Design a protein around this nucleic acid. Structure first.
Ligand SMILES: [Mn+2]
Ligand SMILES: [Zn+2]
Lengths: 340, 373
DNA sequence: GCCTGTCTTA
């Protein structure tokens, strides 16, 4: 794992905590700019290209039939077999969205991608607007279904008061099956998921999603639990089952990347409010087993070691894009790329 | 006594989503904003009053003026019929606030304020003006409601800090305040009018584009070209509702349009507004714009551009030098390299037109300039 | 037929 500094172009200010990166056919894109999109790039979606350790953000355009989704911080994202699902997140006005957006490549002409952003209506057991929650796709019996779990939201309209207008609570830990084909959602209460969970990691393989780490507001604990959630889809009657598995890491806001099929790396995050998770984990997947192994910690610089906060995203090609704030004279943020 | 949180009051009906506690003073401006290391980083310190509570404190402060104003209008001290309060809302950045020993790290601030503009009482089918703020633009009556150390251009923090205030303000728009003054309970109905916003902040909180846009007016949908060709016939068509609507149109793209067509459709409302404002103009800028135009006209009429289309840079520079010298000579007017208010005030006089006519050949153009002025 | 900080002074 080699760490490398990155320089940024004129629009470095766009990068903020909570951003997302999506990978289409090797090309990386950036979404979730700070502030509302400006005339320079009306979509808020950018070609995100690092050449010789220099990062350029170049505006990307939408098709004629697209939504112009608002920039979203800490949304739930996942990859669909190729398109990208974004659900929830905070808008520049601090509102939480309940909508679902789908990003796809509409046209790639002379290496210049046009995107299609389509809003998907959701009926049934729609999950309350959220941020910091997970969504993944499972495949069972030749069928595809979305699984969404966790996160936080504001208080319900009945209990919310202007003195604590911005206070947040964990969502009820109900698993949401979401059929994108029909636009419907069903909520499943499981006895094994008793507490709410936010900023956790989710790994999807076949008919299963594993839930790792995360932070629970009510207890103010980062639990060291690992949860397996299996979904079978026999005809029109789905079934969901959860199992606790010992050996779970305790981490919130960690970043996950895929290094090879059935092997993923977990880097970064927080072990305690004042402490950072400097170690790294390797997860190897079996059809019915998951293994979590300590790996060699990278050669962090002193700036990373002494930073209180760090944030980042998965670029896709086994490489993470990381960022930390700095003071003194100079830059607002300093960015690195960690390869695997 | 003089601070919010001292007197008791009631709202009928109770305000939506606002506490009924009356002993609230200074409250944290983040309004419980999440601060954990996982969340978005909170880099600002802010404090505020509860909007209703601050309205109570301000009213009790002006109690003596209200009673004296009723007396001066030949009304009774003990009368309690519904008073109406016209509250002017304001918000501005305060530029730099840093104290520094060079390597100056800037520190910007935002002040959210309100100004009781007038109080009336319904005595008949008549609204008697028992109070009217004598110096409405003074810093003396601009009651601070929320102070924050954050950039007015930092939209995420601006909306996180201000949204609870706006919510209390909304809630009060649908209720009547009962409060004891001089022993008599009185009732107060409020009218909030967000006029204390300069154009930049208007555009920011109402979803509009930045000031360099083609859509130059925050009252109508005109473009700069349209406004230049069509000079006088426009109407006040923008509104907070329309602007909310246009953001939704922009977001959903319901007629599957290209970005230029969509932008044309929504008249530049490309982000969701979050504060209802009442943009206006100050007496100063009317004068300033008129004077800028008259100054340019003076320079061009000295150069007889009505008669000669082309002119080099040197010819126009000598025209301006002639005009500046002649104003300094006959009108005692210093030349200025930058537009400003009192140059406008002193230049927009018929005397200056006689002066500049001393430099114009044809007197039909004298007549034209005299009539324009 | 540009956008948008930085800088310079008035
Ligand atoms: Mn200002
Ligand atoms: Zn207009």
């Amino acid at each position: 794992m080699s760490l490398q500094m990155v320089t940024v172009g004129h629009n470095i200010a766009l990068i903020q905590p909570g951003f997302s990166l999506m990978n289409f056919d090797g090309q990386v894109f950036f979404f979730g700019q700070k502030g509302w999109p400006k005339r320079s790039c009306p979509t808020g979606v950018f070609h995100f290209d690092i050449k010789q350790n220099h990062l350029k953000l170049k505006p990307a355009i939408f098709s004629k039939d697209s939504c112009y989704l608002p920039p979203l911080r800490y949304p739930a994202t996942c990859s669909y077999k190729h398109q990208y699902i974004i659900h929830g997140g905070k808008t520049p006005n601090n509102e939480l969205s309940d909508k679902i957006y789908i990003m796809s490549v509409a046209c790639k002409n002379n290496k210049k991608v046009t995107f299609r952003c389509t809003e998907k209506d959701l009926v049934g057991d729609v999950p309350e607007p959220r941020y910091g929650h997970s969504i993944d796709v499972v495949y069972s019996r030749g069928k595809s279904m979305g699984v969404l779990f966790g996160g936080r939201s504001y208080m319900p309209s009945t209990q919310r008061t202007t003195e604590k207008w911005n206070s947040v609570a964990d969502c009820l830990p109900h698993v949401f099956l979401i059929d994108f084909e029909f636009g419907c959602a069903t909520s499943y209460i499981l006895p094994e998921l008793q507490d709410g969970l936010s900023f956790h990691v989710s790994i999807a393989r076949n008919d299963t999603v594993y839930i790792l780490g995360g932070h629970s507001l009510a207890s103010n604990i980062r639990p060291a639990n690992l949860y397996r959630i299996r979904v079978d889809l026999p005809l029109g009657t789905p079934a969901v089952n959860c199992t606790v598995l010992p050996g779970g890491i305790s981490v919130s806001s960690a970043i996950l990347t895929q290094t090879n099929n059935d092997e993923f790396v977990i880097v970064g995050g927080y072990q305690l409010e004042n402490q950072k998770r400097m170690v790294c984990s390797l997860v190897s997947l079996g059809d019915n087993t998951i293994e979590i192994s300590e790996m060699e910690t990278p050669d962090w610089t002193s700036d990373i070691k002494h930073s209180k906060i760090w944030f980042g995203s998965n670029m896709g090609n086994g490489t993470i894009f990381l960022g930390i704030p700095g003071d003194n004279k100079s830059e607002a943020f300093y960015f690195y790329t960690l390869r695997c | 006594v003089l601070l919010p949180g001292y007197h008791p009051f009631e709202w009928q009906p109770p305000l939506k989503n606002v506490s009924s506690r009356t002993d609230v003073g200074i409250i944290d401006g983040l309004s419980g904003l999440a601060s954990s290391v996982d969340e978005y980083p909170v880099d600002t310190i802010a404090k505020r009053f509860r909007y209703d509570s601050a309205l109570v404190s301000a009213l009790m402060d002006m109690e003596e003026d209200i009673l004296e104003g009723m007396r001066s209008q030949d009304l009774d001290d003990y009368l309690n019929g519904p008073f109406t309060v016209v509250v002017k809302e304001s918000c501005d950045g305060m530029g730099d606030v840093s104290e520094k020993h060079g390597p100056a790290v800037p520190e910007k601030a935002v002040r959210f304020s309100f100004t009781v503009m007038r109080i009336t009482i319904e005595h008949g089918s008549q609204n008697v003006k028992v109070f009217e703020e004598p110096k409405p633009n003074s810093e003396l009556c601009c009651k601070p409601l929320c102070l924050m150390l954050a950039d007015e251009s930092d939209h995420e923090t601006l909306t996180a800090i201000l949204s609870p205030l706006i919510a209390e303000r909304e809630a009060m728009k649908s209720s009547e305040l009962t409060l004891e003054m001089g022993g008599i309970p009185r009732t107060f109905k409020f009218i909030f009018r967000g006029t204390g916003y300069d154009e930049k902040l208007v555009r920011e909180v109402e979803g509009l584009e930045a000031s360099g846009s083609v859509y130059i007016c925050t009252l109508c949908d005109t473009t700069r070209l349209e406004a230049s060709q069509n000079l006088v016939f426009h109407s006040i068509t923008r509104s907070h509702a329309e602007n909310l609507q246009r953001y939704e149109v922009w977001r959903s793209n319901p007629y599957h349009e290209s970005v230029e067509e969509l932008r044309d459709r929504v008249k530049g409302v490309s982000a969701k507004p979050f504060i209802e404002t009442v943009p206006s103009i100050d007496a100063l800028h009317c004068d300033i714009g008129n004077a800028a135009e008259f100054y340019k006209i003076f320079q061009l009429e000295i150069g007889e551009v009505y008669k000669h289309p082309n002119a080099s840079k040197e010819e126009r520079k000598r025209w301006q030098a002639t005009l500046d010298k002649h104003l300094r000579k006959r009108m005692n007017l210093k030349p200025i390299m930058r537009m400003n208010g009192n140059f406008a005030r002193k230049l927009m006089t018929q005397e200056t037109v006689d002066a500049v006519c001393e430099l114009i050949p044809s007197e039909e153009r004298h007549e034209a300039l005299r009539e324009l002025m």
